């Protein structure tokens with residue numbers, strides 16, 4: 402069909418920053434996570450390397466995708482697909498050439514795929530403040546992120562869903578640890594510590610004559626993978642403006658819905674969640690200045706000069722959003 406042909410053509414840009422992820426979601430019948438993960442697994446030869454039966458991979462991916470909520474505007478399967486594809490591009494950075502093993506690459510991509518699964522569209526702080534069952538279960542720390550992991554791993558146990566069935570026990574143990582370490586690091590309360598440690602690495606950076614990063618121990622390797630997926634998670638402002646604006650519309654819709662719940666419960670409305678007292682453009686400029694740019698400028702220093710085009714786009718978008726403020 403024409404739809405399947407245009408989808409295949411759009412997926413040819415899977416190695417590019419700025420993939421038309423929304424168009425892919427439309428063309429695939431709302432299966433962007435499944436089609437993008439499958440495409441990436443084939444591109445990186447991951448099915449052959451880890452002896453993953455294709456039917457098992459597709460069954461797991463469709464199941465995983467089904468557990469992202471279609472009525473959550475931002476934290477859904479499209480966001481997951483976007484973070485997966487963004488991580489995939491970051492893994493191909495010239496400065497990281499042949500740095501990570503196939504198992505580490507698998508861990509980073511898998512972590513990206515499950516990183517927000519079963520997200521309810523409300524923040525950790527909302528869950529803590531409302532005395533939710535999730536916050537009770539997880540003792541108020543990385544409430545959502547612990548839950549995303551638990552769901553992502555539990556789904557491997559469904560019928561014909563264990564994509565890691567042919568890995569050795571050691572490979573499985575290592576992958577599981579890496580995935581947990583990466584997803585727990587997506588908790589925004591850990592952003593400042595992650596960045597501080599990334600800065601320390603940049604200052605003590607070691608490279609070959611070609612600028613390829615030399616990372617020997619687990620601590621340094623997982624730290625780079627944690628920051629990589631965190632960057633991918635916070636990559637919306639670094640994408641072509643047309644895409645970024647759509648992401649902004651989506652997070653604002655989600656935030657406003659949380660604010661509506663807070664208002665009717667008589668709670669203080671969280672920052673950026675009050676639809677009656679919002680400043681969307683000022684908030685984006687603040688998000689870039691205080692969080693996104695500091696992180697991306699540091700990442701850019703680590704892999705200099707490979708991320709220059711990403712940083713240039715971020716600054717272009719910041720300039721545009723600022724121009725919309727009278």
Ligand SMILES: CCOC(=O)c1c(C)[nH+]n(-c2ccccc2)c1C
Nearest residue numbers: 589634637638645648649652685688
């Ligand atoms: C597209 C613009 O995005 C946002 O403005 C934000 C904010 C302010 N926080 N935020 C989150 C990032 C990671 C995890 C939860 C929220 C996003 C996407």
Ligand SMILES: [Mg+2]
Nearest residue numbers: 516517587588
């Ligand atoms: Mg998250």
Ligand SMILES: [Zn+2]
Nearest residue numbers: 480516517634
């Ligand atoms: Zn996310």
